[PDB]
Amino acid sequence: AQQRKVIRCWACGKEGHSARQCRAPRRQG
């Protein structure tokens, strides 16, 4: 498998992108 659920950008917490592209500076957008 890949990682349990989709890559919800562990750097932000949203399903759709990876922290490598996390455009959310923790609580902001």
The residue among 1 and 29 lying less far from Zn ion, judged by its C-beta, is: 29
Which residues would be at the binding site for Zn ion (CB under 5 A)?
Answer: 9, 12, 22, 24
Q: How far is the CB of 1 from Zn ion (least distance, A)?
A: 21
> DSSP states of 1-29 as a string?
--SSS---TTTT--TTS-GGG----SS--
Least spacing, CB of residue 25 vs Zn ion, in Å: 9
Q: Report in angstroms how near the CB of residue 21 gets to Zn ion at its nearest.
A: 7
Q: What is the CA radius of gyration of the chain?
A: 9
